[PDB]
């Protein structure tokens, strides 16, 4: 009936749980780290979800679950969903023809693209919250 239960060290917002990771990681690094924890690198689909992430975001930048796929020819989230909501910094993205294929979130919450082998100090995972029983 009510789904706001999250594992130790994760934070609940709406029906989801979020892990604000800290550590030195390239994008595909953070992708597998989230998978190891039974989550996914975060997908963002509304301004309310973004505003929650901004309140907890590392000041020095974080990987999120968006990257440019060559065959589909667009940015696609790790869970296969398309970009509806977006929060690009003004002028972004600007490195698609330039090999900057992975997306990070600044301390402001705004997104920019980057080289996938860039090292950042933070990354965010999500998973679904579990629910109250009968």
Residue numbers in the entry: 158 to 291
Paper text:
IgE’s interaction with CD23 modulates both IgE production and functional activities.CD23 is a noncanonical immunoglobulin receptor, unrelated to receptors of other antibody isotypes. Human CD23 is a calcium‐dependent (C‐type) lectin‐like domain that has apparently lost its carbohydrate‐binding capability. The calcium‐binding site classically required for carbohydrate binding in C‐type lectins is absent in human CD23 but is present in the murine molecule.
To determine whether the absence of this calcium‐binding site affects the structure and function of human CD23, CD23 mutant proteins with increasingly “murine‐like” sequences were generated. Restoration of the calcium‐binding site was confirmed by NMR spectroscopy, and structures of mutant human CD23 proteins were determined by X‐ray crystallography, although no electron density for calcium was observed. This study offers insights into the evolutionary differences between murine and human CD23 and some of the functional differences between CD23 in different species.
